[PDB]
From a paper:
TIM family proteins exhibit a classical type I membrane protein structure with an N-terminal immunoglobulin variable Ig-like (Ig V) domain, a heavily O-linked-glycosylated mucin-like domain (MLD) and a short C-terminal cytoplasmic tail. The Ig V domains of hTIM-1 and hTIM-4, exhibit two antiparallel β sheets with the front and back faces formed by A, G, F, C, C′, C″ and B, E, D strands respectively. A hydrophobic cleft formed by CC’ and FG loops, located at an equivalent position in hTIM-1 and hTIM-4 structures represents the putative PS ligand binding site.
We crystallized the Ig V domains of hTIM-1 and hTIM-4 and determined the structures at a resolution of 1.3 Å and 2.3 Å, respectively, using the molecular replacement method. Residues known to interact with PS, including WFND of the FG loop, are conserved among hTIM-1, mTIM-1, hTIM-4 and mTIM-4. As to hTIM-4 and mTIM-4, three extra residues from the BC loop fill in the gap between the FG and BC loop. Results of binding assays performed using SPR showed that amongst the proteins tested only hTIM-1 Ig V could bind EBOV GP. In agreement with hTIM-1 chimeras, the T41 (BC-CC’) and T41 (CC’-FG) chimeras gained some ability of binding to GP, but with a lower affinity of 73 and 208 μmol/L, respectively.
Residue numbers in the entry:
A (entry chain C), B (entry chain H), C (entry chain F), D (entry chain B), E (entry chain A), F (entry chain E), ...: -1 to 112
G (entry chain G): -1 to 111
Write the structure that this text describes.
Amino acid sequence: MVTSETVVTEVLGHRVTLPCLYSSWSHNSNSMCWGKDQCPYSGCKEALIRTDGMRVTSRKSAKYRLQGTIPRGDVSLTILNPSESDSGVYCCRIEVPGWFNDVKINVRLNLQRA
Amino acid sequence: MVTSETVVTEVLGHRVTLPCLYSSWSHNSNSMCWGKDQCPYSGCKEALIRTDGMRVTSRKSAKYRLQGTIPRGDVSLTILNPSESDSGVYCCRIEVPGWFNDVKINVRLNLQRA
Amino acid sequence: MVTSETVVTEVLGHRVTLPCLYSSWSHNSNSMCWGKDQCPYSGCKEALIRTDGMRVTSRKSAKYRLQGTIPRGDVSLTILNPSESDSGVYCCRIEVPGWFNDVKINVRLNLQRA
Amino acid sequence: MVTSETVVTEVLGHRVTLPCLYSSWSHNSNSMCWGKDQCPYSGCKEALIRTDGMRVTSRKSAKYRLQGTIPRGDVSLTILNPSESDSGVYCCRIEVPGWFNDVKINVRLNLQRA
Amino acid sequence: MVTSETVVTEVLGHRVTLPCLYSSWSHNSNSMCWGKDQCPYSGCKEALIRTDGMRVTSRKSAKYRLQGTIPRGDVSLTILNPSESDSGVYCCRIEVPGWFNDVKINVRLNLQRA
Amino acid sequence: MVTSETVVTEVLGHRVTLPCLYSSWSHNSNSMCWGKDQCPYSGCKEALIRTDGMRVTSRKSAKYRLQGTIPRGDVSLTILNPSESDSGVYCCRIEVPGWFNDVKINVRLNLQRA
Amino acid sequence: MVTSETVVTEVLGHRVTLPCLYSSWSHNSNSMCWGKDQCPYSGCKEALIRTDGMRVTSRKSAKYRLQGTIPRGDVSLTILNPSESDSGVYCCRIEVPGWFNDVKINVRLNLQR
Amino acid sequence: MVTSETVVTEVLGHRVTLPCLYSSWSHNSNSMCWGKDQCPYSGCKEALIRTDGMRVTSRKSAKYRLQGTIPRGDVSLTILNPSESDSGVYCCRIEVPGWFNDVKINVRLNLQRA
């Protein structure tokens, strides 16, 4: 099957950001989580980071951060002080009410030397 | 910098194709080549496969084939008897006349066993 | 899950056509079948009507016909002398080579009286 | 004649929602109603549910709910405890000032078992 | 009710053209006619000018001409030796098979002196 | 030369509205006026009705009213107690700072009996 | 007043091309000419170069050539042996039958050292 | 390489604004500067004028002004009493965190005589 994904090509030494925007976001209905390699399953249990529709509900992490305006659907992932092992495919799962309405948006991180 | 790429998720044992289309194609002006991991450098010289404006000019490779119609801009890469080592990023470079007009189109291949 | 479909509103007894177009069609690789209520499963068995990429390979219906240019991807369904039992949802399944590449297109037929 | 409609494919046992959005909505000018199979006539009486510019003013049953933010034009229909008989075509009628300006928006609900 | 129309602002003294293009045109199914003030009724009888799928079938007119390529759907109206009385609203009726599939496209002509 | 316009087809006996929306409107920079047959000249002098960017500043005639939200760019014209002589072409002129930046928006009104 | 134009940033030493496409082109009705700084006046006389709707009708020039397929509306301008003085705004005037129907398309050429 | 730019045509002696809008602007992340003929380099340390994401941080110029709301991304340039030497190409550089994410936006100013 053929799908599409975003590619972020970056340099080591500063935090990097993986874009995920869901413009129609509403704090009343939506929530979100990030996973590596694969999308977290429905109900966002086993994720890198997670939100409720307003803010991060995940325990505070040294690595993972959401620095965008979450109530407007800017759930972009910030990865602090990245290393080469952080390279690879990430999945942003937007939770949508109802049956099989979730949106999965993929971002590939490619870290290289300046 | 952020770009985008096509993802092809496929199964082993049959030929797979990585889509690459250049609608504006004209045989007198355009040319093309394919590369793995990275785009070949300007002048498409050490690539997986290469064409002029009409046809494949590099050898006759058992693994790599272009089965689409090149003069109409269908330069999709076909890979015969693919194995797991064939997974990864491929790059399709459309050569366009002039200064920095070349088009680079990326496709990530993911092969599963099923 | 949320999708979309075309609705064809016609009068009982008049031949009707349910639109289904696949612009990218190739006589070498594509095929198709139509189903009522649900799309036929892959391999288009037990269908209203079916093709190979050139022509209808199904026997012949007094009712069902493909009158468009099948090798150019116009696999629109024509229904002769439709009756009230012919109202309802139809599904046009385009068979595409590879893993989960098939396209499903829905058309709802609504027949009226006078 | 050919029109288009959205299809909502859902599972039994939980409330389902049928989208109907009118962005230009104003509590001063607009009102709305929902009907089954056919759109309610002008003046939105004999309906499943109906509003003024702000809120629901009458419903045929507690089964039907408008839970979106209505003054912003989200008059999407929620159906509580849906059963198989709830499947079929629904029509959302937006009332607009002037002569023949009403908007009719159709949604087909498909409830599945298993 | 609100619709839209094209406006042609022109000068007297040379033939003028009112655009009407129907890209989907096919000589096997489509035909057309022009009317002044209103589109002619279905079946395009007592019209300014009329065609079948290929060509003008109404008597040759000293005033009205179709100079575009009709089999490709260019059924734009040419008006020879225009005078001020030629100003006003025109309607281009595309005849399409089936129930209420005809398309009406309106053009208002405003002719000026010199 | 070819342009386009909105057509409002309405009935006598009730107020009618002619649409003119300018979304980028700002009370600090924009103003507007309506004219019959032609847009009023630059400076909107002797128009049907005119505003200063916030509200109508001249010629709320009797007939002519602006009931939309002017600061949000809804400068749609309401004509109270319309008669047949009110049919015809109207022009909405949006005044914009700088050289020849004004926008002209045309609406043709067609009034029918009742 | 605010309009738009395409920008061609190129390098010296090879012929350069300024795009101008009119998809709707038909040889019976359309014709075309190019001008520098400003559009040539109606009646494409004179331009750097001009056509009749099929092919170039102006004298054959050493500097200016139209290498696209003109009957399909590819009236892009090719400039042979460009120098810095060739930089600036160019205007492609597509002639269309009737009153004030002509299309003007602007391209700015920027040549670098 | 081929890009596009906005053209502003104004009359000498009148203040002009050169549009530059960046919708995604955030006071936390973005900064900007304007240059003539060419974009200022990364880090905007010469330029015509510059901001820190909230306001102009370059010392006040008699010529150059940013009068739009900078925190919403309107970094349009206002030039007071422009003279003939002010004609020409301008470049608006939006600075974005990470590697090669800066956006370059061009405006050509054309000043005409009174």
